[PDB]
Design a protein around this ligand. Structure first.
Ligand SMILES: C[C@]12CCC(=O)C[C@@H]1CC[C@@H]1[C@@H]2CC[C@]2(C)[C@@H](O)CC[C@@H]12
Lengths: 250, 8
């Protein structure tokens, strides 16, 4: 029995994305954030292509396809970054990209140190919880369906169905090698707790990037086209409470 | 927009 679903997730997983950062220059707030913004712009393209290739995604109304990506990109990218940090440098640093690795000094220089420490904590959890590559893939996919508008999507029912199916796939991945129903429940508890922990981080980053865009001209930080549009149009819907994450607990 | 164009 070939695992079709996981086969697909592995196949569509985005390759390496570089930020284009000049590491030969002394670190500066403006340069680091401008590079993170460009990295975001570059990653957004890969996330869109990735999402459109996910099982069942095309079934969502096109407007909803765009909206869910516009609302979930921060969480998705932060989660993938934590995994890269864990696998590449054992969480010793934040591995945003091969050419953009943050040690504590850079975390401080970026003016979002607390957020960076929380992301480092997220990265360590992949190790502490012994998250498998297959669990990572399924969890990352679920993150794309974890934040919706209070007013509902154009075809909310299709979204609910898709989300349920991805949760079911996570159940299957958990059940693999687990004959004890209690061990499966305990694992599901751990993974949903981890998924929930991504949201508070994403929200703090949403707040930070929103404030930065508003004063970007004052601090010499450049925002690429898509990033500027999304942070000025969709992100505010999240910050104002019109779009909310779907938490498993609490 | 540039983002929306990813669907064209
Ligand atoms: C999503 C990115 C870039 C992709 C990634 O690896 C995670 C990282 C998390 C912090 C984001 C950054 C993109 C640019 C942002 C949004 C800055 O404006 C402030 C927070 C930054």
């Amino acid at each position: 029995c070939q695992p079709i679903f996981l086969n697909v997730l592995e196949a569509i997983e985005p390759g390496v994305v570089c930020a284009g950062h000049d590491n030969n220059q002394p670190d500066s707030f403006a340069a680091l954030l401008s590079s993170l913004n460009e990295l975001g712009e570059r990653q957004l393209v890969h996330v869109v292509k990735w999402a459109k290739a996910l099982p069942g995604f095309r079934n969502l109304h096109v407007d909803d396809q765009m909206a869910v990506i516009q609302y979930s990109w921060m969480g998705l990218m932060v989660f993938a970054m934590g995994w890269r940090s864990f696998t590449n440098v054992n969480s010793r640093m934040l591995y945003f990209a091969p050419d953009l690795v943050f040690n504590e000094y850079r975390m401080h220089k970026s003016r979002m140190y607390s957020q960076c420490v929380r992301m480092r904590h997220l990265s360590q959890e992949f190790g502490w919880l012994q998250i498998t590559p297959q669990e990572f893939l399924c969890m990352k996919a679920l993150l794309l369906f974890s934040i919706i508008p209070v007013d509902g999507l154009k075809n909310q029912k299709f979204f609910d169905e898709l989300r349920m199916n991805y949760i079911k796939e996570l159940d299957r991945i958990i059940a693999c090698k687990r004959k004890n129903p209690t061990s499966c429940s305990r694992r599901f508890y751990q993974l949903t707790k981890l998924l929930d922990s991504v949201q508070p981080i994403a929200r703090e980053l949403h707040q930070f990037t929103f404030d930065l865009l508003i004063k970007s001209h004052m601090v010499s930080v450049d925002f690429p086209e898509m990033m500027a549009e999304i942070i000025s149009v969709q992100v505010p819907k999240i910050l104002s409470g019109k779009v909310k994450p779907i938490y498993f607990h609490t | 927009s540039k983002f929306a164009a990813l669907w064209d």
